Design an enzyme around this catalytic site. Structure first.
Site, PDB file in Angstrom:
ATOM      1  N   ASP A  84      14.110  -3.840   4.869  1.00  0.00           N
ATOM      2  CA  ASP A  84      15.391  -3.443   4.304  1.00  0.00           C
ATOM      3  C   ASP A  84      16.536  -4.109   5.071  1.00  0.00           C
ATOM      4  O   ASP A  84      16.353  -4.695   6.137  1.00  0.00           O
ATOM      5  CB  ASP A  84      15.538  -1.918   4.303  1.00  0.00           C
ATOM      6  CG  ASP A  84      16.504  -1.423   3.231  1.00  0.00           C
ATOM      7  OD1 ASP A  84      17.086  -2.258   2.493  1.00  0.00           O
ATOM      8  OD2 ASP A  84      16.699  -0.190   3.137  1.00  0.00           O
ATOM      9  N   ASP A 253       8.497   1.918  -2.089  1.00  0.00           N
ATOM     10  CA  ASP A 253       8.292   2.114  -0.643  1.00  0.00           C
ATOM     11  C   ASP A 253       7.881   3.536  -0.322  1.00  0.00           C
ATOM     12  O   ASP A 253       8.425   4.476  -0.885  1.00  0.00           O
ATOM     13  CB  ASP A 253       9.510   1.690   0.196  1.00  0.00           C
ATOM     14  CG  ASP A 253      10.781   2.439  -0.168  1.00  0.00           C
ATOM     15  OD1 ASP A 253      10.912   3.630   0.174  1.00  0.00           O
ATOM     16  OD2 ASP A 253      11.687   1.836  -0.762  1.00  0.00           O
ATOM     17  N   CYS A 289     -11.327  11.303  -3.840  1.00  0.00           N
ATOM     18  CA  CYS A 289     -10.797  10.247  -2.991  1.00  0.00           C
ATOM     19  C   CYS A 289     -11.923   9.504  -2.283  1.00  0.00           C
ATOM     20  O   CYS A 289     -12.866  10.109  -1.764  1.00  0.00           O
ATOM     21  CB  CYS A 289      -9.856  10.866  -1.958  1.00  0.00           C
ATOM     22  SG  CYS A 289      -9.180   9.697  -0.770  1.00  0.00           S
ATOM     23  N   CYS A 291     -11.505   7.557   0.393  1.00  0.00           N
ATOM     24  CA  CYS A 291     -11.101   7.125   1.724  1.00  0.00           C
ATOM     25  C   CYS A 291     -12.112   7.567   2.782  1.00  0.00           C
ATOM     26  O   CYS A 291     -12.950   8.449   2.560  1.00  0.00           O
ATOM     27  CB  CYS A 291      -9.694   7.626   2.062  1.00  0.00           C
ATOM     28  SG  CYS A 291      -9.558   9.231   2.911  1.00  0.00           S
ATOM     29  N   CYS A 294     -12.218  11.342   3.633  1.00  0.00           N
ATOM     30  CA  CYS A 294     -12.862  12.210   2.654  1.00  0.00           C
ATOM     31  C   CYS A 294     -14.354  11.942   2.545  1.00  0.00           C
ATOM     32  O   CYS A 294     -15.097  12.814   2.080  1.00  0.00           O
ATOM     33  CB  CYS A 294     -12.172  12.081   1.295  1.00  0.00           C
ATOM     34  SG  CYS A 294     -10.474  12.706   1.314  1.00  0.00           S
ATOM     35  N   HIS A 320      -5.587   9.392   5.054  1.00  0.00           N
ATOM     36  CA  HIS A 320      -5.911   9.856   3.710  1.00  0.00           C
ATOM     37  C   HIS A 320      -4.734   9.680   2.757  1.00  0.00           C
ATOM     38  O   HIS A 320      -4.917   9.241   1.616  1.00  0.00           O
ATOM     39  CB  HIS A 320      -6.350  11.319   3.700  1.00  0.00           C
ATOM     40  CG  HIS A 320      -6.273  11.921   2.335  1.00  0.00           C
ATOM     41  ND1 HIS A 320      -7.233  11.699   1.367  1.00  0.00           N
ATOM     42  CD2 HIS A 320      -5.309  12.669   1.751  1.00  0.00           C
ATOM     43  CE1 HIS A 320      -6.870  12.312   0.252  1.00  0.00           C
ATOM     44  NE2 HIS A 320      -5.703  12.900   0.457  1.00  0.00           N
TER      45      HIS A 320
HETATM   46  C1  E89 Z   1      10.819   1.146   6.617  1.00  0.00           C
HETATM   47  O1  E89 Z   1      11.147   0.246   5.564  1.00  0.00           O
HETATM   48  C2  E89 Z   1      11.939   0.696   4.542  1.00  0.00           C
HETATM   49  C3  E89 Z   1      12.361   2.026   4.614  1.00  0.00           C
HETATM   50  C4  E89 Z   1      13.185   2.554   3.607  1.00  0.00           C
HETATM   51  C5  E89 Z   1      13.595   1.781   2.515  1.00  0.00           C
HETATM   52  C6  E89 Z   1      14.491   2.293   1.410  1.00  0.00           C
HETATM   53  C7  E89 Z   1      15.903   2.680   1.893  1.00  0.00           C
HETATM   54  C8  E89 Z   1      16.813   3.067   0.743  1.00  0.00           C
HETATM   55  C9  E89 Z   1      16.688   4.296   0.064  1.00  0.00           C
HETATM   56  N1  E89 Z   1      15.823   5.336   0.314  1.00  0.00           N
HETATM   57  C10 E89 Z   1      16.097   6.259  -0.576  1.00  0.00           C
HETATM   58  N2  E89 Z   1      17.122   5.879  -1.388  1.00  0.00           N
HETATM   59  C11 E89 Z   1      17.515   4.622  -1.005  1.00  0.00           C
HETATM   60  C12 E89 Z   1      18.505   3.779  -1.496  1.00  0.00           C
HETATM   61  C13 E89 Z   1      18.630   2.559  -0.827  1.00  0.00           C
HETATM   62  C14 E89 Z   1      19.677   1.617  -1.264  1.00  0.00           C
HETATM   63  O2  E89 Z   1      20.431   1.861  -2.195  1.00  0.00           O
HETATM   64  N3  E89 Z   1      19.767   0.456  -0.552  1.00  0.00           N
HETATM   65  C15 E89 Z   1      18.949   0.132   0.491  1.00  0.00           C
HETATM   66  N4  E89 Z   1      19.133  -1.065   1.084  1.00  0.00           N
HETATM   67  N5  E89 Z   1      18.003   0.933   0.896  1.00  0.00           N
HETATM   68  C16 E89 Z   1      17.819   2.182   0.261  1.00  0.00           C
HETATM   69  C17 E89 Z   1      13.157   0.453   2.453  1.00  0.00           C
HETATM   70  C18 E89 Z   1      12.332  -0.077   3.454  1.00  0.00           C
HETATM   71 ZN    ZN Z   2      -9.147  10.818   1.252  1.00  0.00          ZN
END
Ligand code: E89
Ligand code: ZN
Ligand code: E89
Ligand code: ZN
Lengths: 355, 355
Positions: A84, A253, A289, A291, A294, A320
């Site tokens: 991110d 994610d 599952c 995994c 399990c 898990h």
């Molecule tokens: C550890 O690696 C990562 C961890 C978390 C995320 C997502 C984070 C996130 C948001 N999370 C909820 N709403 C979001 C919304 C956003 C968003 O609008 N912009 C960005 N840049 N990130 C958001 C991406 C990678």
């Molecule tokens: Zn499992």
């Protein structure tokens, strides 16, 4: 050799798609779940893991990670990594905002975010955006989205200036606009004019609830280029994933947070393994599952470990949960490919919510 | 099929021995280290693991463990398990002592200890003893040891009364007597008259320090039957193990506690991985260790995980520490078998303490 970036759609059902992203370090099957790399020893399983830009830029620092050989070498992971851009995390965890960037307790700008992600060596780089708080008025959502679009252009230019990055990594733009259809459209138009390798739906999973999130996805995903991957940031529970795939999302994610707090995901819904009802339950965490947890251990034993304060319990829960999410994504991919995703989604919900 | 219990000595060097214990569930190579079973997913690696009698009798209770199928089924471990008798733990963690047993906040007697270990299903059962506090006067050490010897006879009789236990498990007696040679001799004589499958040296690792512990072992181990295994309870650091093997000890029960507190064992001594000196150290935890952690990840990454609060860091440390101890025991066994244990002990100490 594989290309820098190539997304191919193999099959469709309604708005749902399944396919592959080819990158130099590997192929990513979509729809994809991308786990946190530090949560467990993730095996290739996941096709791509997340690096934690915000944490890494503070400890040990992006320059230090580069000195150690980059995140792939540091983490022992030779496949793709997504990072991110760091602003969401700064605004949620740390601040002073300006057109230049965000200062916090130390200045994070589009240019610095891209250079941090370059030093980390990640394969999918996110544009530096502002995740608009929820709720937002139309005026505030518009001003915020407009700044994010200016930052998206600066992110594009910074990425293109670094030869190793431009030639070997990919850059995703992030749509903003809160819950407003006209702002989501303006944001999509601005991102498509700049041009990105993939498009994220940002500004959701910020407290709006599933009904509203799905309503926003209904109009927002079709605004993005169809031939590029769609990444819904911050989502989510298994049912959020299924509904988002039904609305055209390709990448996602909780499974790590839940695994450290006693929550296990199953096809019959989540369970809190610490509850006394599991103290004598000889069934595995989930009856289907595949995994390693399990295959070997009962709910009763994992309950025992967690109640005893044994770190092994939380690790088995986390392993898990990650495996469950990957089995979910595999079932999603197979059902779209086979033209039975609508039936899968219906069957999934009926069982997951019956508990 | 293997016998209920058979100890064979394959080779000797000075007082050190190497050999095997055969039991129905497997062979145990000696000298042996016996890790806590709940510390990690222990693989067969260790030949025998420890069950935690004191914890299990409180949660979920021995009767409940028996209802779930016994510890082997519960833990997913089909090889031998050793359990302690529970009094050491009651006296250290919980009390009212009497000739009947120990009451605590609820009565643990020799008969109840043996029945708890029967319900858990363990393969090596410890007699119910009193670990005399240190320091102890000669009078108090004598009275304590005398009670332990009466309890050892009651433990023998209770074990022999349970057919499944008498036919399939083994019973070890525990020598007491504090630091006093005459009391250690009386205790050894009493235990040999009762007759046990193996003999433990109890009452050490209670704050006396290595010099005194070795001095007590010097005269105490030769008092035990030579043809039976010798188990030193509660020991210890790698150097304690080497010196105890030099004094005739065959079995040992820190690597888990250290792994959860940032301490890793190496051939160059212990290291605290959280220290900033490791933040850029690309070497594995130990330069020679063959464990899966040292094959894949650097000190720098494990340091990062632990400093970030990631449970994965502590699990990798614990897996390395258990593997290190098993490599230590393998080197001990090989060097005794090859007649080079004296040289190994000298080389080990010179490097371990050079740091
Ligand atoms: C550890 O690696 C990562 C961890 C978390 C995320 C997502 C984070 C996130 C948001 N999370 C909820 N709403 C979001 C919304 C956003 C968003 O609008 N912009 C960005 N840049 N990130 C958001 C991406 C990678
Ligand atoms: Zn499992
Ligand atoms: C989890 O499984 C196990 C955990 C710990 C132990 C060793 C406990 C222990 C001592 N520890 C240090 N000194 C001791 C001394 C003694 C001792 O004198 N008697 C007994 N019964 N136990 C002792 C055995 C098994
Ligand atoms: Zn190792």
């Amino acid at each position: 050799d594989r290309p820098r970036f190539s997304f191919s759609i193999a099959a469709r059902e309604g708005k749902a798609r399944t396919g592959t992203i080819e990158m130099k370090r590997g192929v990513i099957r979509t729809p994809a779940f991308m786990p946190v790399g530090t949560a467990a020893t993730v095996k290739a399983g996941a096709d791509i893991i997340l690096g934690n830009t915000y944490h890494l830029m503070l400890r040990p620092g992006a320059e230090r990670i580069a000195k150690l050989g980059g995140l792939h070498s540091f983490m022992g992971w030779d496949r793709p990594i997504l990072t991110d851009s760091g602003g969401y995390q700064v605004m949620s965890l740390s601040t002073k905002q300006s057109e230049e960037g965000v200062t916090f307790k130390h200045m994070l700008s589009p240019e610095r975010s891209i250079e941090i992600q370059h030093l980390l060596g990640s394969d999918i780089v996110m544009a530096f955006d502002e995740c608009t708080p929820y709720p937002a008025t139309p005026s505030r959502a518009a001003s915020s989205m407009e700044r994010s679009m200016r930052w998206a252009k600066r992110s594009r230019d910074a990425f293109d200036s670094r030869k190793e990055q431009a030639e070997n990594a990919a850059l995703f733009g992030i749509q903003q606009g809160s819950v407003f259809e006209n702002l989501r459209q303006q944001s999509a138009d601005a991102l498509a004019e700049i041009g990105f390798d993939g498009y994220a739906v940002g500004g959701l999973a910020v407290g709006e609830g599933q009904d509203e999130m799905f309503r926003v996805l209904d109009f927002s995903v079709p605004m993005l280029p169809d031939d590029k991957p769609h990444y819904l940031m911050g989502v989510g529970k298994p049912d959020d994933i299924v509904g988002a795939v039904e609305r055209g999302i390709d990448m996602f994610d909780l499974p790590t947070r839940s695994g450290r707090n006693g929550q296990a995901f199953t096809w019959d819904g989540p369970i809190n393994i610490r509850n006394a009802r599991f103290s004598e339950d000889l069934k595995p965490l989930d009856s289907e599952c595949h995994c390693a947890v399990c295959q070997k251990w009962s709910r009763a034993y994992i309950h025992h470990l967690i109640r005893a304060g044994e770190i092994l319990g939380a690790m088995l829960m986390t392993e898990h949960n990650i495996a469950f999410y990957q089995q979910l994504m595999q079932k999603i991919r197979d059902s779209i490919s086979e033209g039975r995703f609508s039936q899968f989604a219906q069957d999934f919900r009926a069982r997951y919510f019956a508990r």
